[PDB]
Design a protein around this nucleic acid. Structure first.
Ligand SMILES: [K+]
Ligand SMILES: [Mg+2]
Ligand SMILES: [Mg+2]
Ligand SMILES: [Mg+2]
Ligand SMILES: [Mg+2]
Ligand SMILES: [Mg+2]
Ligand SMILES: [Mg+2]
Ligand SMILES: [Mg+2]
Ligand SMILES: [Mg+2]
Ligand SMILES: [Mg+2]
Lengths: 41, 152, 26, 124, 205, 97, 181, 46
RNA sequence: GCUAAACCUAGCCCCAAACCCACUCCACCUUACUACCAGACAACCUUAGCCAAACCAUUUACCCAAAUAAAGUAUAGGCGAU
RNA sequence: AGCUACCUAAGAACAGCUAAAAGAGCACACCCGUCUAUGUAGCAAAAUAGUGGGAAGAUUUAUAGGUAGAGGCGACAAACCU
RNA sequence: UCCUCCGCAUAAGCCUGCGUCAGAUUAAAAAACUGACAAUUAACAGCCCAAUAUCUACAAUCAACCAACAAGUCAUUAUUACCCUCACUGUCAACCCAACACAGGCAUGCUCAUAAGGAAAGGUUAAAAAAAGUAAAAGGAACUCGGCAAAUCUUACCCCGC
């Protein structure tokens, strides 16, 4: 049984939702946004 | 001949005879200017100039004075969609010179006049096509793109 | 193409919410 | 490197290669001293061409011809139409010798014939 | 001379046509169409048959099968199941609108009673003379097989032999006399060719 | 990207096809049948896996023993390498000794 | 003469030339060998004429008038071959009992394969032929493992084809569940 | 000096080194061909 | 709004069952795929090593013809690793 | 061993000037690569320009063949063997 | 107007790779691209010899005179056998080895100077720095590790290795 993640889109938006008001590439690129959202929280 | 085992010959042995030849040739129009008595053929690769001499005088009763041949390489340059080469086959060309002062000019096998049939054709589909376009005309500039159908 | 139904259904719901915000009905 | 996929032909290689390989034409003689080629008349195939004056069979056959069932010839059908008539006759006449089969067309051996059926020694 | 990929998709235009080359190039790889296996014996619809369209806008209508495409279980019913398309259309010319038929599946059309002129189901049965025919499963009236124009296109009624056609008398003549001789030996004798030189034995290996 | 834009074709399950409706029938063939047959005799599968279980090294050893003489050469060579590989892994590596 | 490589000058330029049917094999079995020796050459001259026209069509970038004419002559010449080969084949079986005109044998090759070796014609016996005796008609033991790997490859091909047929037949009874019956 | 041009083609050399007859000449060269036939190569040799 | 995105088939995997594969006319061991000459040339013969032993040097499992069990027992071994 | 090292068979090239015994000198073709600059993802995975060493010889070079990795080959640089 | 390495042939290699037509659009910018159709013709070249015995000391170098050593590429006879006569293949190109339409590699003949073969500048401006040159007052190695490079066209010596 090969299991692959199918709802990764929704996992990503959970971070990106809080990054939309940031500046630069850290408002859309998860790799960068996830670090700035953690710092913001 | 082709694709057949030739009986081996030993000295003091019978003549080699072919009753039903599978050699098939085509008379071709030359690509360059040739002498008047020269006729060009495309012949099988396994057909020699001695065969072609005895072939033309045997089957067609053409008196032959000289035969010359050359092997044309077919382009292997084309690629199909898999980037694999497509081979245009090689073929043998023969130059035949007629004997008793005879000459030859390759006939015109597609005369224009004959390709125009005087007899009329009454195909509904073809006629409908030409008829309908003629009835339709260009939009009148002064109507400014208003549909013309409405009689009003 | 990944197996399953739930994420596809859930994504359909999100595309439907966006259409409404894009074209709010009267 | 070299092309491995293309056909190997006499157009390829050096002078010694290109003249040694051919294109499949059968030979009609031999070379002697001086690279003198001797054409052997009997090795040149002679076309046996029939007389076609007043021949009534033409390239095509008219569409107004009755259909027939295909029956490939077999050794039996050939036997029962070219040999049986004479054997059967002589069997009733008590002249059938089961030893002298040459009378009816049997060839005990192919050696000595111009056209030997096996091994075939004639062109099509 | 036939070059059809393994999953070639049959369609309206015939294999090899200009439109078929345009729709199915050598590199095309579409998902296969799943077609119900109908054995060649159980196929009861032929060119010329009269069928009743059972599904579509022309459902309930009747018409003649103008084309059968076996590979899709299709039949084209002349003038029915139609939509509209333009033809001869260029840049300037709008074109000529024509009706164009869409194919139907063997399940969407039923054959019609030979006399009742009503949709009926057929079961292939043999006759007293053992001839496979289409016997109605509802009435028994045998629906005959029509005569569609020979695919070749030759109407034997209007056939007149040309200068390169053999006469029936000559074509049906029998000049063959069975003999224990090859065409080689007979022609040598017929043309009076004499060979005294005996063929010497060869080594075969 | 990465998420399908339409719903997949709906999946219909016949919970009462013959395979499901009769599943488990004869699993008590021994205790209800005077133990003439063991329930393991109902298992269909590879000859080397019927009524038997093991880790992957045991399965490979068991398959090699029982059908190894009948295996294709490429497959037998892979099995020999797999046994050797698992032999080193299970006997020499790991957190616990 | 050379006019026999072309059609009748009246047919030059016509979009169609009406043509009869191809000589059927059965129509030719009624005919003598001498009549088929003549008929062959009537077909040869037509084929050469049709081959000429086909090429000149390509040279002129025009369609060949009535192309099926060429397809008929080929079919008609194929029949005649078959009819003439049936007779010598049948005659060869009666007089010698041999099923093939050319001698041969089943041989192992240097690669371990069983192949039908067609004999060639020679003037010397085989034990004196240098080039012939260089060919190996046997295989050595190092070939054995390769025969097994080739057989196992063939079996893998056959196993996949059969398993795929059973898969696609199962998908048919899903799409058409009225097909089980 | 500049490298890269170590291939100096000759049909004689190519045929004598890697051709069909050279391969069949030794049991190791026959097994070269068997390997290439198993893999299904279009070119078994030069 | 572009570039894109999305797809469900092709086939494949593991089992089971069953012991597979030829010439198709012509060509092909010589420079394979090359119609057609005076030869003799002929096959067999212990794997090793990585690695483990925390080095390494004796030693270090490798289907060999019934699943299970006897048994990781008798036994072998720088009596160590195994 | 189509590069390169060495070898085998059978080829080829070497102008002019001086000197005239010639592994003599000057100097082209040709072979090499001293020094400088350029270039350093180049024109080039070693080049270009100039300047150089040799240039009838232990010369240079075309062709085919030979020696094979526990090895070859080597005017030993542990060189060269795609 | 300017360049000229060159160039033309053969060999080897390569294998249709700037012919025509029709397409698209031609090229590190704007046909050598696609598809069809053509095409290289043997005298040059390649492809060769019936047997058995036997014969074959005396270079080449303008081969003469001289003079050599490293001592060399060119030859038959005897007797048998031997009527039979022009097949087959190469023949194109703007080309090959260098991942390239690569300043490299590439044998022979002939011309070289050319009768043959080619174009250094897309347009402009005319800063730095950089590259390649030419010229340079007075001085003339004061430069520098060193006269390196340039210029000129020198002398004498030391070490090492003949
Ligand atoms: K160690
Ligand atoms: Mg390289
Ligand atoms: Mg000097
Ligand atoms: Mg040296
Ligand atoms: Mg040293
Ligand atoms: Mg050192
Ligand atoms: Mg100073
Ligand atoms: Mg200072
Ligand atoms: Mg200096
Ligand atoms: Mg000293």
């Amino acid at each position: 049984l090969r299991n692959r993640v199918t709802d990764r889109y929704f996992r990503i938006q959970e971070v990106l939702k809080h990054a939309r008001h940031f500046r630069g590439r850290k408002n859309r690129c998860y790799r960068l946004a996830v670090r700035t959202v953690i710092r913001a929280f | 001949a082709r694709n057949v085992v030739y009986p081996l010959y030993r000295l003091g042995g019978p003549q080699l005879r072919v009753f039903r030849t599978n050699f098939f040739i085509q008379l071709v129009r030359p690509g360059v200017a040739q002498p008047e008595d020269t006729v060009q053929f495309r012949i099988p690769m396994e057909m020699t100039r001695v065969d072609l001499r005895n072939y033309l005088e045997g089957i067609y009763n053409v008196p032959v004075a000289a035969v010359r041949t050359r092997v044309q390489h077919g382009s292997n340059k084309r690629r199909d969609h898999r980037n694999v080469r497509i081979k245009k086959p090689d073929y043998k060309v023969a130059y035949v010179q007629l004997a008793h002062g005879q000459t030859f000019t390759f006939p015109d096998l597609f005369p224009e006049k004959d390709e125009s049939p005087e007899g009329s054709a009454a195909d509904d589909l073809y006629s409908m096509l030409e008829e309908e376009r003629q009835q339709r005309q260009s939009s009148d500039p002064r109507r400014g793109g208003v549909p013309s159908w409405f009689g009003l | 193409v990944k197996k399953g139904f739930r994420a596809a259904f859930r994504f359909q719901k999100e595309l439907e919410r966006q259409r409404l915000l894009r074209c709010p009905p009267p | 490197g070299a092309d491995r996929m293309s056909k190997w032909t006499s157009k390829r290689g050096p002078r010694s290669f290109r003249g040694r390989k051919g294109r499949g034409a059968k030979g009609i003689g031999f070379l002697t001293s001086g690279w003198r080629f001797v054409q052997i008349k009997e090795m040149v195939p002679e076309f046996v061409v029939p007389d076609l004056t007043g021949f009534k069979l033409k390239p095509y056959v008219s569409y107004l011809a009755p259909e027939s069932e295909e029956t490939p010839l077999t050794a039996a059908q050939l036997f029962s139409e070219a040999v049986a008539p004479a054997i059967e006759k002589d069997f009733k006449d008590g002249t059938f010798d089961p030893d002298n089969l040459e009378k009816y067309g049997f060839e005990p051996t192919q050696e000595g014939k111009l056209f030997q059926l096996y091994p075939r020694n004639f062109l099509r | 001379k036939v070059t059809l990929p393994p999953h070639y998709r049959y369609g309206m235009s015939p294999p090899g046509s200009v439109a078929d080359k345009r729709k199915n190039p050598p590199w095309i790889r579409r998902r296969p169409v799943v077609v119900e296996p109908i054995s060649d014996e159980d196929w009861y619809l032929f060119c010329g048959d009269t069928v009743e369209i059972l599904e579509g806008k022309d459902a309930g209508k009747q018409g003649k099968v103008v084309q059968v495409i076996r590979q899709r279980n299709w039949v084209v019913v002349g003038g029915l199941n139609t939509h509209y398309r333009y033809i001869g259309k260029t840049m300037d010319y709008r074109g000529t609108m024509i009706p164009s038929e869409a194919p139907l599946l063997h399940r969407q059309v039923k054959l019609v009673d030979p006399m009742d002129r009503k949709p009926t189901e057929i079961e292939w049965r043999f006759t007293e003379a053992g001839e496979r025919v289409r016997v109605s499963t509802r009435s028994g009236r045998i629906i005959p097989k029509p005569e569609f124009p020979r695919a070749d296109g030759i109407v034997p009624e209007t056939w007149i032999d040309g200068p390169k056609d053999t006469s029936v008398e000559d074509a049906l003549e029998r000049t063959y006399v069975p003999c224990l001789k090859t065409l080689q030996e007979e022609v040598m004798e017929a043309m009076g060719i004499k060979e005294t030189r005996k063929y010497k034995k060869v080594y075969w290996y | 990207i990465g998420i399908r834009l339409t719903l997949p074709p709906p999946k219909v399950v016949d919970r009462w096809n013959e395979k499901r409706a009769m599943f488990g029938v004869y699993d008590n063939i021994g205790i209800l049948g005077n133990f003439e047959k063991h329930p393991k005799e109902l298992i269909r599968g590879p000859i080397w896996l019927r009524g038997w279980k093991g880790n992957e090294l045991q399965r490979c050893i068991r398959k090699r023993k029982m059908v190894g003489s009948r295996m294709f050469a490429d497959d037998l060579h892979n099995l020999n390498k797999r046994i050797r590989y698992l032999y080193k892994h299970f006997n020499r590596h790991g957190k616990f000794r | 003469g050379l006019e026999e490589f072309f059609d009748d000058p009246k047919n030059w330029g016509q979009e169609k030339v009406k043509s009869g049917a191809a000589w059927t094999c059965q129509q030719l079995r009624n005919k003598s060998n001498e009549d088929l020796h003549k008929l062959w050459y009537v077909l040869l001259k037509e084929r050469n004429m049709l081959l000429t026209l086909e090429q000149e069509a390509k040279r002129q970038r025009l369609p060949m008038p009535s192309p099926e004419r060429l397809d008929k002559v080929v079919d008609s010449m194929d029949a005649l071959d078959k009819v003439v080969q049936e007779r010598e084949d049948a005659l060869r079986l009666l007089q010698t009992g041999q099923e093939r005109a050319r001698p041969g044998a089943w041989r192992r090759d240097i690669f371990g394969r069983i192949i039908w070796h067609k004999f060639k014609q020679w003037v010397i016996p085989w034990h004196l032929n240098k080039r012939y005796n260089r060919k190996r008609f046997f295989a050595l033991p190092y070939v054995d493992h390769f025969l097994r790997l080739e057989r196992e490859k063939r079996a893998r091909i056959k196993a996949r084809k059969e398993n795929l047929e059973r898969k696609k037949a199962k998908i048919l009874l899903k799409k058409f569940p009225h097909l089980a019956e | 000096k500049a490298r890269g041009n170590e291939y100096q083609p000759s049909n004689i050399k190519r045929k004598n080194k890697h051709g069909w007859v050279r391969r069949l000449s030794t049991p190791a060269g026959v097994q070269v061909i068997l390997r290439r036939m198993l893999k299904g190569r279009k070119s078994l040799s030069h």
